[PDB]
Design a protein around this ligand. Structure first.
Ligand SMILES: Cc1cc2nc3c(=O)[nH]c(=O)nc-3n(C[C@H](O)[C@H](O)[C@H](O)COP(=O)(O)O)c2cc1C
Ligand SMILES: COC(=O)/C(C)=C/CC/C(C)=C/Cc1c(O)c(Cl)c(C)c(C=O)c1O
Ligand SMILES: O=C(O)c1cc(=O)[nH]c(=O)[nH]1
Length: 366
């Protein structure tokens, strides 16, 4: 372990969190990232960490989850942190404010966060222009194993959900290596009902048609991001639709509306999605289920409570080809990225895997 890891985790981050309200801290973190006010990412990615999936090379399998850089303001700073891929968003078609403040809450005793942002978004046009300003820089990054994902949401007041996602595909699809159809935010009324079989098939047919209409060089993979709170029936239905339509992958999972027994944080009963440690194993089990239901043939990006190499490898062994983290960054700061990667490499060696690829879904073959 490094001096920076300890300094950030034990001193700098908790001291600053003591001084800054959650959303102010989030805004400052985005600003610091965009400005490159970041510690040295000392860890060099080994060949063992490379993954080929979704029509792309990923230099390492650790990405930043959606919701950190909602508006595509900090993409390059996120690569400088050592993330193998960056996901921005969620982005809505029209700009919208989201919910009133406060709308993000720390649960320090649980290493968790609850948020009810409600898709605060600069909107498609602003994000489009932001991504266009660095489009060729991104093309080079992608070629060098550092892909970009764009996560799409829907406006609060929109009368046609499928048309919102279609607009996102048309506007940001040409700027993305992959798109995410986010049907799992707990903070937009009626959104999670789009995970239902009939609604999902209709929505995804339209999304895929719009994607297929993009020029070849500008044609992204399409993934669906799902909740950790689905019934067994819901999961069976999603797997069926994914296979029927040839959806490129799944992101598993969004935040939970559950409140696991044992939460200690004073703010545990705030409305919103819960992330971090209490979500971890619920998310891992959802990855495990979805991998089995799709016969290991559908790439999964595993997300929820990853804060160590062990957390990452558990999701990989459960069936994730790639992982993301967010809440761990909020507690431990930028050095957490190198920590996860270093620990993951060590564990892969210890468990006799030649690399990440060999470990994907390994628990299912035990
Ligand atoms: C403050 C906050 C905002 C988020 N915003 C989004 C979002 O806009 N779109 C999305 O798909 N997921 C969003 N998420 C969910 C994360 O992408 C991720 O699925 C979830 O937090 C679990 O990972 P973690 O435990 O590493 O944070 C957000 C999470 C947090 C904590
Ligand atoms: C990348 O940011 C940094 O390196 C530093 C030192 C940021 C200072 C502000 C800070 C202590 C942020 C921690 C924090 C938070 O405390 C909370 Cl609650 C959230 C939601 C986020 C979202 O990114 C978050 O980053
Ligand atoms: O904007 C939000 O509230 C949000 C979206 C999402 O998909 N997940 C989440 O936890 N929050």
């Amino acid at each position: 372990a490094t001096g920076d890891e300890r300094f950030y985790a034990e001193h700098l981050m908790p001291t600053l969190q003591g001084l800054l309200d959650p959303e102010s801290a989030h805004r400052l973190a985005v600003r610091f990232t965009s400005l490159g006010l970041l510690p040295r990412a000392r860890f060099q990615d080994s060949d063992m960490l490379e993954v080929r999936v979704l029509g792309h090379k990923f230099r390492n399998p650790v990405g930043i989850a959606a919701g950190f850089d909602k508006h595509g303001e900090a993409v390059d700073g996120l690569y400088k942190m050592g993330f193998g891929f960056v996901e921005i968003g969620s982005v809505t078609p029209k700009p919208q404010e989201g919910n009133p403040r406060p709308r993000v809450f720390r649960l320090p005793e649980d290493q968790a966060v609850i948020n009810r942002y409600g898709f605060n978004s600069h909107g498609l046009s602003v994000v489009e222009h932001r991504l266009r300003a660095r489009q060729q820089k991104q093309a080079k990054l992608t070629e060098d194993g550092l892909p970009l994902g764009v996560n799409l949401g829907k406006n609060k007041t929109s009368v046609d959900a499928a048309e919102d996602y279609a607009e996102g595909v048309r506007v940001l699809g040409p700027l993305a290596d992959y798109l995410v159809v986010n049907v799992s935010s707990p903070n937009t009324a009626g959104l999670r009902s789009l995970q239902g079989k009939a609604e999902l098939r209709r929505l995804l047919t339209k999304v895929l048609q719009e994607r297929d209409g993009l020029r070849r060089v500008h044609r992204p993979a399409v993934l669906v991001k799902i909740a950790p709170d689905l019934t067994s029936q819901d999961k069976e239905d999603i797997a069926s639709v994914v296979k029927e339509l040839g959806i490129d992958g799944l992101i598993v999972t969004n935040t939970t509306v559950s409140r696991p027994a044992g939460l200690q944080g004073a703010l545990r009963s705030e409305t919103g999605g819960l992330s971090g440690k209490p979500l971890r194993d619920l998310s891992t089990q959802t990855i495990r289920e979805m991998y089995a239901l799709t016969q290991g043939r559908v790439p999964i990006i595993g997300v929820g409570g990853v804060s160590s190499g062990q957390d990452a490898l558990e999701k990989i062994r459960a069936g994730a080809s790639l992982v993301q983290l967010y809440t761990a960054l909020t507690f431990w700061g930028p050095p957490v990225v190198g920590k996860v990667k270093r620990e993951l490499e060590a564990l892969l060696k210890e468990q006799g895997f030649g690399g990440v690829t060999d470990a994907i879904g390994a628990d299912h073959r035990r």
